[PDB]
C-alpha cells in the first residue's frame, strides 16, 4: 500500500495554500514526496 502510494505521489501537482491569501503568489503547486512523520514538509525558499 505504501509502495503504491509512493508510486502515485509522482507526477501529481499538489496545490499548497495558506489562509490569508493576500497576493497572487499565495497558492502554488508542488510535487509530493512521501515523507515519514505527521507533518507536511516544505521547501525553504517558498516561505516568503
Which DSSP state fits 4? H
**What contacts 42, CB < 8 A, 6 or more positions away?**
16
Residue 6 within binding range of other proteins, rule CB under 8 A = yes
- In the complex, the smallest distance separating the C-beta of residue 29 from other proteins, rounded to whole angstroms, is 14
Residue 47 within binding range of other proteins, rule CB under 8 A = yes
- In the complex, the smallest distance separating the C-beta of residue 3 from other proteins, rounded to whole angstroms, is 7
Task: Closer to other proteins by CB, 23 or 38: give it.
Answer: 38
Amino acid at each position: 500500500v505504501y509502495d503504491v502510494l509512493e508510486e502515485v505521489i509522482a507526477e501529481h501537482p499538489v496545490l499548497l495554500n495558506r489562509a490569508p491569501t493576500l497576493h497572487r503568489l499565495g497558492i502554488q503547486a508542488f510535487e509530493p514526496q512521501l515523507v515519514e512523520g505527521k507533518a507536511i514538509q516544505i521547501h525553504p525558499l517558498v516561505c516568503t
